[PDB]
Amino acid sequence: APPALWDLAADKQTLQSEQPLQVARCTKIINADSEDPKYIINVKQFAKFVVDLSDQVAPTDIEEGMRVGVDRNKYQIHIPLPPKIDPTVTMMQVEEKPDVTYSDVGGCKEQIEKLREVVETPLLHPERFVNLGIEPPKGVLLFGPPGTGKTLCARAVANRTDACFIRVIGSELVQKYVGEGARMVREL
Amino acid sequence: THELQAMKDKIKENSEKIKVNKTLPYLVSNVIELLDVDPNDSQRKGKCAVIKTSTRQTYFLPVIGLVDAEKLKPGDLVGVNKDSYLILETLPTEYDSRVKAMEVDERPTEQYSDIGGLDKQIQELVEAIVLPMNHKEKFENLGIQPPKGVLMYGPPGTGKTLLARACAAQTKATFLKLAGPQLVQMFIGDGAKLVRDAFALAKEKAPSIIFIDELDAIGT
Amino acid sequence: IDAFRLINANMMVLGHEPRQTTSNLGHLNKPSIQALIHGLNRHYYSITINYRKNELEQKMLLNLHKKSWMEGLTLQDYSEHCKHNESVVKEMLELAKNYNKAVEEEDKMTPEQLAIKNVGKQDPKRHLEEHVDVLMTSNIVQCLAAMLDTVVFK
Amino acid sequence: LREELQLLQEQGSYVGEVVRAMDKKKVLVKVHPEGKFVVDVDKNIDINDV
Amino acid sequence: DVLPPEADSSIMMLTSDQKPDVMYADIGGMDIQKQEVREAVELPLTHFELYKQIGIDPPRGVLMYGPPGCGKTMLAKAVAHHTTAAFIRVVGSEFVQKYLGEGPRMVRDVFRLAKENAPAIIFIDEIDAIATKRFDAQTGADREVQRILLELLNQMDGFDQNVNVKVIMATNRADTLDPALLRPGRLDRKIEFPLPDRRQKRLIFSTITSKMNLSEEVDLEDYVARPDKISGADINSICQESGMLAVRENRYIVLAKDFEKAYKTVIKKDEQEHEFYK
Amino acid sequence: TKQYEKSENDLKALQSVGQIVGEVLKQLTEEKFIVKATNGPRYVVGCRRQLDKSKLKPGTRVALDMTTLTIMRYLPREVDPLVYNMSHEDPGNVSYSEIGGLSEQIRELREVIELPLTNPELFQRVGIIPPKGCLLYGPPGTGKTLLARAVASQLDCNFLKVVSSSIVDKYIGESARLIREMFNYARDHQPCIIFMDEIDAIGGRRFSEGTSADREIQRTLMELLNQMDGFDTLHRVKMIMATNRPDTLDPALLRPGRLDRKIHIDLPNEQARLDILKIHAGPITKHGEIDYEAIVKLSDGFNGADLRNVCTEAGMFAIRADHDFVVQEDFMKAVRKVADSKKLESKLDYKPV
Amino acid sequence: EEERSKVDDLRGTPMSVGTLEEIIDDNHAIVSTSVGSEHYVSILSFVDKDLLEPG
Amino acid sequence: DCTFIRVSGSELVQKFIGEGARMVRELFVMAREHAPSIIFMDEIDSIGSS
Numbered sequence A: 001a002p003p004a005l006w007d008l009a010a011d012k013q014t015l016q017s018e019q020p021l022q023v024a025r026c027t028k029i030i031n032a033d034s035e036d037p038k039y040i041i042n043v044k045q046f047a048k049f050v051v052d053l054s055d056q057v058a059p060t061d062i063e064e065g066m067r068v069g070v071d072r073n074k075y076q077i078h079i080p081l082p083p084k085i086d087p088t089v090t091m092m093q094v095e096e097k098p099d100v101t102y103s104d105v106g107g108c109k110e111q112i113e114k115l116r117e118v119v120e121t122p123l124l125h126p127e128r129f130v131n132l133g134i135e136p137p138k139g140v141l142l143f144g145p146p147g148t149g150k151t152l153c154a155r156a157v158a159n160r161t162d163a164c165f166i167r168v169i170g171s172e173l174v175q176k177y178v179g180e181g182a183r184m185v186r187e188l
Numbered sequence B: 001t002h003e004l005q006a007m008k009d010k011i012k013e014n015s016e017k018i019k020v021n022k023t024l025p026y027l028v029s030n031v032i033e034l035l036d037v038d039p040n041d042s043q044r045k046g047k048c049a050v051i052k053t054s055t056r057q058t059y060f061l062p063v064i065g066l067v068d069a070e071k072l073k074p075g076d077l078v079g080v081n082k083d084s085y086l087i088l089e090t091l092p093t094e095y096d097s098r099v100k101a102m103e104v105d106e107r108p109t110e111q112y113s114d115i116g117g118l119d120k121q122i123q124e125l126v127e128a129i130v131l132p133m134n135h136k137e138k139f140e141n142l143g144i145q146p147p148k149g150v151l152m153y154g155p156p157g158t159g160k161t162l163l164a165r166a167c168a169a170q171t172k173a174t175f176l177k178l179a180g181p182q183l184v185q186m187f188i189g190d191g192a193k194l195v196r197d198a199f200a201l202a203k204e205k206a207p208s209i210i211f212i213d214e215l216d217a218i219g220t
Numbered sequence C: 001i002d003a004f005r006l007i008n009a010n011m012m013v014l015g016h017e018p019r020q021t022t023s024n025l026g027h028l029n030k031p032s033i034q035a036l037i038h039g040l041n042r043h044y045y046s047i048t049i050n051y052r053k054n055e056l057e058q059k060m061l062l063n064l065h066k067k068s069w070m071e072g073l074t075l076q077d078y079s080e081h082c083k084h085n086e087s088v089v090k091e092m093l094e095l096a097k098n099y100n101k102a103v104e105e106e107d108k109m110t111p112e113q114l115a116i117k118n119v120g121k122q123d124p125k126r127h128l129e130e131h132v133d134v135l136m137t138s139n140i141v142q143c144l145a146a147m148l149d150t151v152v153f154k
Numbered sequence D: 001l002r003e004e005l006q007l008l009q010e011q012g013s014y015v016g017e018v019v020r021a022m023d024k025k026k027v028l029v030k031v032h033p034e035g036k037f038v039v040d041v042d043k044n045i046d047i048n049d050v
Numbered sequence E: 001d002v003l004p005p006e007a008d009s010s011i012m013m014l015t016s017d018q019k020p021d022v023m024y025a026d027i028g029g030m031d032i033q034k035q036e037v038r039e040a041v042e043l044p045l046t047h048f049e050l051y052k053q054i055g056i057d058p059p060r061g062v063l064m065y066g067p068p069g070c071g072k073t074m075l076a077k078a079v080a081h082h083t084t085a086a087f088i089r090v091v092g093s094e095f096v097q098k099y100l101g102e103g104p105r106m107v108r109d110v111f112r113l114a115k116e117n118a119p120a121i122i123f124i125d126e127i128d129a130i131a132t133k134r135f136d137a138q139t140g141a142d143r144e145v146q147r148i149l150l151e152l153l154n155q156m157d158g159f160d161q162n163v164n165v166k167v168i169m170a171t172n173r174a175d176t177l178d179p180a181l182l183r184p185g186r187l188d189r190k191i192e193f194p195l196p197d198r199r200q201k202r203l204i205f206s207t208i209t210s211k212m213n214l215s216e217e218v219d220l221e222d223y224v225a226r227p228d229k230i231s232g233a234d235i236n237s238i239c240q241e242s243g244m245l246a247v248r249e250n251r252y253i254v255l256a257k258d259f260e261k262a263y264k265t266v267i268k269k270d271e272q273e274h275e276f277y278k
Numbered sequence F: 001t002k003q004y005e006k007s008e009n010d011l012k013a014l015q016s017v018g019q020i021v022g023e024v025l026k027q028l029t030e031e032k033f034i035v036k037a038t039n040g041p042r043y044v045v046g047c048r049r050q051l052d053k054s055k056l057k058p059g060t061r062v063a064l065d066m067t068t069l070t071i072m073r074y075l076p077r078e079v080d081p082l083v084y085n086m087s088h089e090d091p092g093n094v095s096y097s098e099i100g101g102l103s104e105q106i107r108e109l110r111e112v113i114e115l116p117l118t119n120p121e122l123f124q125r126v127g128i129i130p131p132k133g134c135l136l137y138g139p140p141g142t143g144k145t146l147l148a149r150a151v152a153s154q155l156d157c158n159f160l161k162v163v164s165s166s167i168v169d170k171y172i173g174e175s176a177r178l179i180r181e182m183f184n185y186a187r188d189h190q191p192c193i194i195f196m197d198e199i200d201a202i203g204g205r206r207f208s209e210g211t212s213a214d215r216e217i218q219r220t221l222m223e224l225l226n227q228m229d230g231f232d233t234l235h236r237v238k239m240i241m242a243t244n245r246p247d248t249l250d251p252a253l254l255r256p257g258r259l260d261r262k263i264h265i266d267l268p269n270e271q272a273r274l275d276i277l278k279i280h281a282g283p284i285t286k287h288g289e290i291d292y293e294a295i296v297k298l299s300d301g302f303n304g305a306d307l308r309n310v311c312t313e314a315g316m317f318a319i320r321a322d323h324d325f326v327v328q329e330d331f332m333k334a335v336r337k338v339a340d341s342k343k344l345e346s347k348l349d350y351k352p353v
Numbered sequence G: 001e002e003e004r005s006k007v008d009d010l011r012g013t014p015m016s017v018g019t020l021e022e023i024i025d026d027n028h029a030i031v032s033t034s035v036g037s038e039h040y041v042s043i044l045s046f047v048d049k050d051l052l053e054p055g
Numbered sequence H: 001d002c003t004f005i006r007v008s009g010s011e012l013v014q015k016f017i018g019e020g021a022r023m024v025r026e027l028f029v030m031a032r033e034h035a036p037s038i039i040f041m042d043e044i045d046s047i048g049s050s
């Protein structure tokens, strides 16, 4: 209750900050540029508006297909929004946190080594391969008997150095109502 | 004889009054040209045109005001201000976002010197694309009709894609990257409208080059 | 009708709130009556309207429209309604007779249905009443018909 | 009829459908053309009757 | 205040007074379909009490199927000249619009003008359009208009009983129709258009030969025999093709030659030596 | 100087806002008119004193006031897509003379198309109804669209072209009712010719019930089918249909009425092949020594399009030799070789009847 | 106490029930409600913003 | 006096009862709401289909 007390007591500053930016509805995709000051823009409301932008945003920062905020009164451009696509399919695609470290190997040596140098070493020592390049390979392919399918990837999870990586399940690509997979594969 | 400057002052003051109706050509709408006279029931004659909206409504308004009926066939994108329902100017061209411009290819980094052993068969590729550009003056004399589409096919590689693209930097023509399955969309009629919209700006950007891949997939 | 008045906009620094004899002010600002009407309270104020007579010409102006329904000679259209008094009026009374059979045999089930629903809960049907208009039209028939013995005779 | 007309003139009156009730005295109401709303008591009608 | 009735809305009624094309003397071939339809249409419409006497509830359900041959609308044009009633001519897809809110009012308006202007006959052509099932939201309006088909299915229950309506229905494919529509209690009559037969061959030849000029050389024996080995058909439109091969000319009156030509033109294919079994 | 003031005075007239379009449903009384905006809402309103009740009539497009919602001015009709359909341009004339085969097919279509318009009297005597539809299909050979298109420019009169991509209309497949619009102005502007290309996509058989838009197209049929089973006179108007194969057309379209006649394209005969060869040798420059029969004998079974592609390839082979005048020896080189390559790419060319 | 009599005036009386589309590190959240509408919502109260997550 | 319930049912038994599911549970939730209830198999009895 104390945290909710201080949580609900910030609405007095929140309502003062509630006057600006709350009319930012909605997100709208732009179309073409006729000149520098004037841009044609489309919105999900189905009304396409041609309008100018606010003086607080550099016009050179807006590129065709960029979604931006709008002050519905004046319709002018308010603030651009980097995120565009996609609904929950993306967040389900994202994975985080490690598990299954390297100590879980079952004795495979040349295998695990040759696949270590394709992925982990290029991002561990990028300047090394760029210096001595040539060029690192694109990627690998795993298959065969079940032992051990798919666990070798868990090794890359725990051995990931800094930035987390994303795992994807196969069967979710193919879906009813054909044409959903097209958007799917593209956005990621 | 000096009163012409007085009328000059009133036409500039009215032009300044036009500026307040020119801000801003907000909404996009579609046009239907019409000309009719209505007898009564002393006489009232002229021209009146039908207008669409982006909000699914369709209105009726006297003919603009400013730009005359010299242009054009029923169009769109015409700027009209809120509830005023007056088109100040007719703004081109067409639409829309990625459908307007599929892909903007500046130039590929690769050149034809990175390939070998294709010298015989690269000449047939280079021919169909290069020969129409420079030799049109030769074709008018010889009655020659240039090729258009060329079918390049095989398992990689080959490597058809890279070569076909690389020669496009050497012809300076505008290159538009297009993938086959892109014609498949979640909604119907998208690919049709998409192709029409593709060759539109191709005719606007002429000469240019459009490339597609996996035609066998979308042409079964 | 209506009436308006423009208040001065440059007076916005001083008191904008008269008047004296606020009676007519109170009856005029009422009812308020929606929103658009109230949107004119600022920058504008209404002003009262009252008729004046001129009761002489108003008296004739009443009798002109009222006498419009009356005939010129007054014995013309009443005797034409006496020509009507037997037309097709025996047939118009057959029209009334069909309304009195058809509405009454279904309005004679209503006293029985009142025992089923117990008693006057909604309802209505209808098919209900309507005999008042039938009696009033029949009374018009019998009175215009009673004019016969007055007019035709002398 | 005049005054009642005035209260129903602006917005009229809507037709609500309760998808769920909440213990906070606020009842979830859904309108067919529109989205899902929720509105508080409503003292004339008891909560257990909703 | 409410609608008078009835001033619509849409469609509208009438429009059929300056029409129909031709009387029923045209098609004389069937004779077993007309005995069903006539008894299922003009008899219940003329005398409502005669059914209540004998204690049989006349249905309003009329179902047609079998094309080709076409049958179908020709009967609508016939019954139009038999009796004076209000006729509805509407395309299965005609009422589908951009807003689903217009659907229910539209079917209701059809029916309410029907009951106001009764006796009346309503004809919708190939409702199998709205008989197909889909779940998506885009077809959600199509699902709403098939629940509108169910809503008119409820309104005709409003018509039960007695006064009044008449609903005739035809379809090119009956496999797509849902069993709830064909269920007894609503459509109690299923009329199937049969393939033309010898008795119908000679009738279908007489009717076309009355309108077009004929020759004494032309004989219908070989035309009721040799085409009768397979067809079938469409036979009428091949006679029309004999007219169209006369209009290829430059001809006074058609002879046997053009008929024999219309046979080998359109259409036959063999298909097959695999048939050598029999 | 003063013309500008004329324009500025026009702006003073532009201070009058537009109105909303709407269709006249009925009139309850002379003070009550039932009108329906294109948006869907209905309104019972009045009218001014300039209009006549008799001239209005139901089902009339009119403009309603922004506030009173009453009729001020009316218009007879309007249609936005059709203007595009009346802008098709077909060269020839001469192109009609250059197509060659098939002669007798042309002699069929010339009649079925042109005669009913010029001599309607001959039909009424015999009692034969003029064919209201026709079917031209390929590509067993080619020349479908060309030939019919040439008739558009030969017969002149009116012509209307519709691309098969106009039926979808994304959501709300109302383009089905746009067919009723199409036949509306077909009944106004008559006579007119209408083309339907790639009908197999929009006239399929709904054999396997599935997905979604499979059904909407079946509903577009119903507009075509019911308007050509009318209840309507299409005698003045003409229609042409084309496809890869008459497999999807259903018993509905294979039935007469809608499709009265059927003309299949055939592979160019060697005698006709000499003709089509001739018309492509004209604009081309060759040596004084020429023999076309060598090509006719060497080229068998090719499509009339493929013949022209071969002639052009013979010329496009001469630019490597850079010579201005080109002998037919070099031609037979490029012809023989490249055409035979076309045979290697000719797989799956067999098409059903 | 006073907070219950305060925050209630901000939300009521009418309110709509939408769905969360995506969250921005600027505390502006993009919401989607019937039908096809977007917006920037920034509120510091009752959240629970981390446990919500889009969808 | 118990309620009579039939199995599918087309088309419209699926929409009225939930959005999408096993379809044998949500229906059984209606039969749980009203008891007693009789379930019937209608019909898929044909020679089609033989």
Ligand SMILES: Nc1ncnc2c1ncn2[C@@H]1O[C@H](COP(=O)(O)OP(=O)(O)OP(=O)(O)O)[C@@H](O)[C@H]1O
Residues within 6 Å of the ligand: B114, B115, B116, B117, B118, B155, B156, B157, B158, B159, B160, B161, B162, B213
């Ligand atoms: N015959 C060749 N000559 C020169 N380079 C080649 C040849 N074959 C392959 N390559 C090289 O192989 C690389 C991979 O090209 P790849 O064959 O995968 O492309 P592609 O097959 O055209 O792609 P797609 O299958 O999408 O058309 C290219 O960088 C190309 O330079």
Ligand SMILES: Nc1ncnc2c1ncn2[C@@H]1O[C@H](COP(=O)(O)OP(=O)(O)OP(=O)(O)O)[C@@H](O)[C@H]1O
Residues within 6 Å of the ligand: E026, E027, E028, E029, E067, E068, E069, E070, E071, E072, E073, E074, E172, E204, E207, E236, E237, F225, F229, F230, F251, F252, F255, F256, F257, F258
């Ligand atoms: N005596 C006849 N017997 C059979 N068919 C005929 C006869 N007279 C005309 N027809 C055909 O009937 C057609 C019109 O019938 P109708 O309007 O019912 O079409 P339809 O049955 O709706 O079409 P479909 O069943 O193919 O959808 C005409 O094209 C004509 O060829």
Ligand SMILES: Nc1ncnc2c1ncn2[C@@H]1O[C@H](COP(=O)(O)OP(=O)(O)OP(=O)(O)O)[C@@H](O)[C@H]1O
Residues within 6 Å of the ligand: F098, F099, F100, F101, F138, F139, F141, F142, F143, F144, F145, F146, F276, F304, F305, F308
């Ligand atoms: N008889 C002919 N005379 C001249 N050119 C022809 C002839 N037939 C075809 N062509 C050539 O073929 C091209 C297309 O004509 P057509 O409509 O027959 O092709 P198509 O029917 O689309 O072919 P397909 O049906 O195989 O797609 C034209 O550009 C024309 O140059």
